[PDB]
PDB file of C-alpha atoms in Angstrom:
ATOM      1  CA  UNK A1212     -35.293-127.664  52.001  1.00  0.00           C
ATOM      2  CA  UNK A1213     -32.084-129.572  51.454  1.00  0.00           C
ATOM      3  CA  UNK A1214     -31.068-130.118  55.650  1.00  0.00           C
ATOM      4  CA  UNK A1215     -27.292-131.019  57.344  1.00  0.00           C
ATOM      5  CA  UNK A1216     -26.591-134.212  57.355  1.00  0.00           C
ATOM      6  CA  UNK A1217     -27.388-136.965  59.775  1.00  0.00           C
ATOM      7  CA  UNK A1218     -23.777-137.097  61.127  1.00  0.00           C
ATOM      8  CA  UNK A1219     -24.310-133.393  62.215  1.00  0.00           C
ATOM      9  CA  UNK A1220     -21.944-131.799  64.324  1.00  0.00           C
ATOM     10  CA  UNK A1221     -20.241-131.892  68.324  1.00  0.00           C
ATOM     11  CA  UNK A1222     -19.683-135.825  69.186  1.00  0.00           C
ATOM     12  CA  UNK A1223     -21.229-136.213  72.914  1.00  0.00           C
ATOM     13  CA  UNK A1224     -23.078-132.902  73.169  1.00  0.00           C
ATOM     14  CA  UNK A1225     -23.719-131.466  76.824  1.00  0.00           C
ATOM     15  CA  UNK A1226     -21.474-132.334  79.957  1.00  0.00           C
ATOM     16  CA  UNK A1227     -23.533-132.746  82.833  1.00  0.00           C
ATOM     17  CA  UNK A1228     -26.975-131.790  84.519  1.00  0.00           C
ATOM     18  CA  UNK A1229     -27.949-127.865  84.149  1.00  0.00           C
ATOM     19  CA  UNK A1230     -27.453-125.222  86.595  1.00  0.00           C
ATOM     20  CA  UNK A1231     -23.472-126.902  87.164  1.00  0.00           C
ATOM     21  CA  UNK A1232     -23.199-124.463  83.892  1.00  0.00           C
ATOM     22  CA  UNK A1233     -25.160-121.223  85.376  1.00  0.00           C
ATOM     23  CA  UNK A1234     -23.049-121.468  88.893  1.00  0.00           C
ATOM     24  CA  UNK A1235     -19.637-120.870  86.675  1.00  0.00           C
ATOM     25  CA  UNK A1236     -19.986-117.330  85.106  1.00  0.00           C
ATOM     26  CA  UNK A1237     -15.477-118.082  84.388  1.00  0.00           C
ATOM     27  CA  UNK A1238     -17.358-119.573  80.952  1.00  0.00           C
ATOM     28  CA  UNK A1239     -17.165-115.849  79.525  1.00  0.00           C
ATOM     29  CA  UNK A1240     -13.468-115.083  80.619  1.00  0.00           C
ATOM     30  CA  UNK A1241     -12.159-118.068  79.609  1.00  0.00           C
ATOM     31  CA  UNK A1242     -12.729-119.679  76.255  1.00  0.00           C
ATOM     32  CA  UNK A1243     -14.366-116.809  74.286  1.00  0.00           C
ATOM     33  CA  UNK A1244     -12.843-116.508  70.779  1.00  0.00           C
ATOM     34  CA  UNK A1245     -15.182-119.693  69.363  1.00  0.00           C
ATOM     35  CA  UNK A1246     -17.978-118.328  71.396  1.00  0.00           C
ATOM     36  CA  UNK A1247     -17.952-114.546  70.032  1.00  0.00           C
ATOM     37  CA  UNK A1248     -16.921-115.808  66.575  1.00  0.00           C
ATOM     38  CA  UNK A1249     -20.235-118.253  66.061  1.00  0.00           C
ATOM     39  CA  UNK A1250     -22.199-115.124  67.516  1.00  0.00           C
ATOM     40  CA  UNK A1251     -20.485-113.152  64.966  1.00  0.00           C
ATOM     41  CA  UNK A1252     -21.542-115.415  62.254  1.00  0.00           C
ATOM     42  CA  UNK A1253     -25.191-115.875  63.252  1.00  0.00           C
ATOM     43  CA  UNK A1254     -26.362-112.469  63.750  1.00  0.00           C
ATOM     44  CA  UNK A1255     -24.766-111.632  60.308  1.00  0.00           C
ATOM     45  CA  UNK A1256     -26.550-115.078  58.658  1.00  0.00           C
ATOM     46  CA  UNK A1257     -29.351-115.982  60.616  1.00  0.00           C
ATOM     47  CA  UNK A1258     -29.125-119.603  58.990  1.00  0.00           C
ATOM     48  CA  UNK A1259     -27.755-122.324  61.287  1.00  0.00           C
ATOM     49  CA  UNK A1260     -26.961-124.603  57.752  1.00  0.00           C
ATOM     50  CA  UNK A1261     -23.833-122.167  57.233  1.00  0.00           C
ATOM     51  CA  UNK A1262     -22.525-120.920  60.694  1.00  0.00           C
ATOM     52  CA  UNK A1263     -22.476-124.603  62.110  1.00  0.00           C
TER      53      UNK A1263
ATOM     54  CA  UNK B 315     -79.942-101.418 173.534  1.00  0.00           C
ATOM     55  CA  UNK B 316     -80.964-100.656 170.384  1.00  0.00           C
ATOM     56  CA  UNK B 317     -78.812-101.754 167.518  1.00  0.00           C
ATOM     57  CA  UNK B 318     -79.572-100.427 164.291  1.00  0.00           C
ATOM     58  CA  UNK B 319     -77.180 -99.447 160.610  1.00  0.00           C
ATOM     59  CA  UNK B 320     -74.398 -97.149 161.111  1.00  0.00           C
ATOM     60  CA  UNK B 321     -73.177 -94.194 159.147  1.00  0.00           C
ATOM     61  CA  UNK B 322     -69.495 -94.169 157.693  1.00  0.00           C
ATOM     62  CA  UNK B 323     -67.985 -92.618 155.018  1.00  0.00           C
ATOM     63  CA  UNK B 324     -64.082 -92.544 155.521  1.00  0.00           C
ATOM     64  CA  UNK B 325     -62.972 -91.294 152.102  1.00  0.00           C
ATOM     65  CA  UNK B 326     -66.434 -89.960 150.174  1.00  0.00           C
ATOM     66  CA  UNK B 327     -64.319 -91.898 147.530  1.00  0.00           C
ATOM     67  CA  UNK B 328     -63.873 -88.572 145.903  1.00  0.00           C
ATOM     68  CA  UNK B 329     -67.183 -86.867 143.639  1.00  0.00           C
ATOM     69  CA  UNK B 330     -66.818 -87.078 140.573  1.00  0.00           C
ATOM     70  CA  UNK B 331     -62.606 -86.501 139.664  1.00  0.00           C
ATOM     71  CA  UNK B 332     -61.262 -86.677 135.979  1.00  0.00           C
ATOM     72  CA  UNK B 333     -59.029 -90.009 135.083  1.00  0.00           C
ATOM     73  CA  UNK B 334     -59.026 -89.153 131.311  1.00  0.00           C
ATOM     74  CA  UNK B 335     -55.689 -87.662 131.076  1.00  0.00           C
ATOM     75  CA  UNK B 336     -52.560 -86.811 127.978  1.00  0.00           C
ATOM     76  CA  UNK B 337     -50.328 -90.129 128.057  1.00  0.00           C
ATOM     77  CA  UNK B 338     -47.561 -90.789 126.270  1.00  0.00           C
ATOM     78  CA  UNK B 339     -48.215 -89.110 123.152  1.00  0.00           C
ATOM     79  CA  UNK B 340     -47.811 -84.997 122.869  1.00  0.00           C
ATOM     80  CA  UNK B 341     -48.411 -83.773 119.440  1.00  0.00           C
ATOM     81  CA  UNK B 342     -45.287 -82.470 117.656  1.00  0.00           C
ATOM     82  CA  UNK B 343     -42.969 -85.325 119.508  1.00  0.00           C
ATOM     83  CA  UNK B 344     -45.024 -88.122 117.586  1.00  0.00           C
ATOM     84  CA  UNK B 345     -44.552 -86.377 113.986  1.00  0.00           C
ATOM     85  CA  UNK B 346     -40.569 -86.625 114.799  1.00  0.00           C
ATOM     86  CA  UNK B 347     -41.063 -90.323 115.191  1.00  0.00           C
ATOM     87  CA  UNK B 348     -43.381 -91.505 112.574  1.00  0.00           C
ATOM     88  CA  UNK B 349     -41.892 -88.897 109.405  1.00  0.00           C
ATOM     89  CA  UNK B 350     -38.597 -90.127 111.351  1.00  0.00           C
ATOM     90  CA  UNK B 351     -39.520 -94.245 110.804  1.00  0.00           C
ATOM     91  CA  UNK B 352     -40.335 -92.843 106.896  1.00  0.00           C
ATOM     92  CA  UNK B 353     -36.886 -91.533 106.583  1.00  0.00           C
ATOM     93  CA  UNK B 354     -35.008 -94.460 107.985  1.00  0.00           C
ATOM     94  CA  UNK B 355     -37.456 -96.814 106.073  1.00  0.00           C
ATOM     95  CA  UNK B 356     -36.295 -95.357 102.790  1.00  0.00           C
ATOM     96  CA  UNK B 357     -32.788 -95.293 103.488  1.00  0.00           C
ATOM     97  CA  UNK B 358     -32.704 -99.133 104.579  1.00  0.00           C
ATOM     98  CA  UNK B 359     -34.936-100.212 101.753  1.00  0.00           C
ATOM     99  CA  UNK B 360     -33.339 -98.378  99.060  1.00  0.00           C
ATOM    100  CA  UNK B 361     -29.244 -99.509 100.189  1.00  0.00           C
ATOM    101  CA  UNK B 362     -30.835-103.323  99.724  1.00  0.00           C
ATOM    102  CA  UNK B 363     -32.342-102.785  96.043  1.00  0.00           C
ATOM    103  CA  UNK B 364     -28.342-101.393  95.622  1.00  0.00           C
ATOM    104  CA  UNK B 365     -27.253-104.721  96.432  1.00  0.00           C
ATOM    105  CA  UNK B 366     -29.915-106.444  94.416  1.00  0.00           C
ATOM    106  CA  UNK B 367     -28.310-104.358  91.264  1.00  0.00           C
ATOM    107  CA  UNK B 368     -25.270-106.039  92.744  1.00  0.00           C
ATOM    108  CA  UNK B 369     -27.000-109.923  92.134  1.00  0.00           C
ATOM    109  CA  UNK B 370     -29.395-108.670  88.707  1.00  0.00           C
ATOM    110  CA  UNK B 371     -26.222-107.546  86.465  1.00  0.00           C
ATOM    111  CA  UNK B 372     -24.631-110.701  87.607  1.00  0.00           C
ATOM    112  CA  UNK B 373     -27.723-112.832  86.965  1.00  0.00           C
ATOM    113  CA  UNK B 374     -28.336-111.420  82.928  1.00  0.00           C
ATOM    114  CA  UNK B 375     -24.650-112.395  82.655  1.00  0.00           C
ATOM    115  CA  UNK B 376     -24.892-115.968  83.163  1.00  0.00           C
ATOM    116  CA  UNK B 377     -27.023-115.792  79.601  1.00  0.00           C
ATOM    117  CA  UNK B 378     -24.837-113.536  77.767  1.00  0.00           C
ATOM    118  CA  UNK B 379     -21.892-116.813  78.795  1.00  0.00           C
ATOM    119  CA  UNK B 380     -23.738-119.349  77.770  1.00  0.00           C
ATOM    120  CA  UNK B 381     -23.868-119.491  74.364  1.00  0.00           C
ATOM    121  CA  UNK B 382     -23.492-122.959  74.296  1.00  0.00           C
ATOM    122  CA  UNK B 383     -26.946-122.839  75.764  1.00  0.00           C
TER     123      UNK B 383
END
């Protein structure tokens, strides 16, 4: 299958507790270039091993 | 003396008088108020599912901003 390895990716993944990230809808304003850029990616390669 | 049941009538307390009577309601009066309750029912009802657009678009949002997620 040859997977990632265990190192992986993101160090400390998450910030908090959900719905703190559903009452702040400033997420898609602000910060959207690496957002729209790994959406880009994975609807063009559906792999996650090459858009991570 | 002799004392027996008198007679007495006063009133006759009236034979036989109609108390069934129209109240209230007329005919073409009610029709103005109950197709009139349909037509403000709508009006109010459909202004509120105008403002629920107002909180749906919003809601679908929140998951088109998380990507994260």
């Amino acid at each position: 299958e040859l997977p990632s390895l265990e190192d992986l990716k993101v160090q400390e993944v998450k910030v908090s507790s959900s719905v703190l990230k559903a009452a702040a809808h400033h997420y898609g304003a602000q910060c959207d270039k690496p957002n729209k850029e790994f959406m880009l990616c994975r609807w063009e390669e559906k792999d996650p091993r090459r858009c991570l | 003396x002799x004392x027996x049941x008198x007679x007495x009538x006063x009133x006759x307390x009236x034979x036989x008088x109609x108390x069934x009577x129209x109240x209230x309601x007329x005919g073409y009066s009610m029709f103005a108020v109950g197709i009139g309750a349909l037509l403000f029912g709508y009006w109010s009802m459909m202004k509120w599912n105008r403002e629920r657009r107002r909180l749906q678009i919003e809601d679908f949002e929140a998951r088109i901003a998380l990507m994260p997620l």
